């Protein structure tokens, strides 16, 4: 659990108090938020909070699963949304720390 242990107490950590995390903290709320299309066209959604709880629950089988679950957050994004879109910006920001984070993760 080394590296899942990284994985919570760093990666998800630092991302978390990143100041543009907020809008990956919760599942988007298509109700509020009037997104009905959104989980049409993102079959596989994640956000924070999910990966929070998977690594609270030891959900995950391996470091690489948990990576993943990171990746297709960033990837939905990108996906949905618009270039010069707010939460774009703040998805690029957010992934540069992971990338620089993921780079510092000693090997299992
Ligand atoms: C991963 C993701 C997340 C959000 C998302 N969560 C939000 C939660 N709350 C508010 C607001 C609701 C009203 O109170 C203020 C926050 C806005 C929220 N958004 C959008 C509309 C948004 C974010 C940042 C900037 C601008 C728009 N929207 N899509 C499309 C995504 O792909």
Same mark, same amino acid.
């Given at each position: 659990t080394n590296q899942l242990q990284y994985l919570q107490k760093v990666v998800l950590k630092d991302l978390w108090k990143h100041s543009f995390s907020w809008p990956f903290q919760?599942?988007?709320d298509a109700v509020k938020l009037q997104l009905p299309d959104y989980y049409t066209i993102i079959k596989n959604p994640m956000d924070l909070n999910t990966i929070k709880k998977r690594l609270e629950n030891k959900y995950?089988? $391996?470091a690489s699963e948990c990576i993943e679950d990171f990746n297709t957050m960033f990837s939905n994004c990108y996906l949905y949304n $618009?270039?010069?879109d707010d939460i774009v910006l703040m998805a690029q920001a957010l992934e540069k720390l992971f990338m620089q984070k993921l780079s510092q993760m000693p090997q299992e």
């Open positions: 919760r599942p988007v995950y089988a $391996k $618009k270039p010069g």
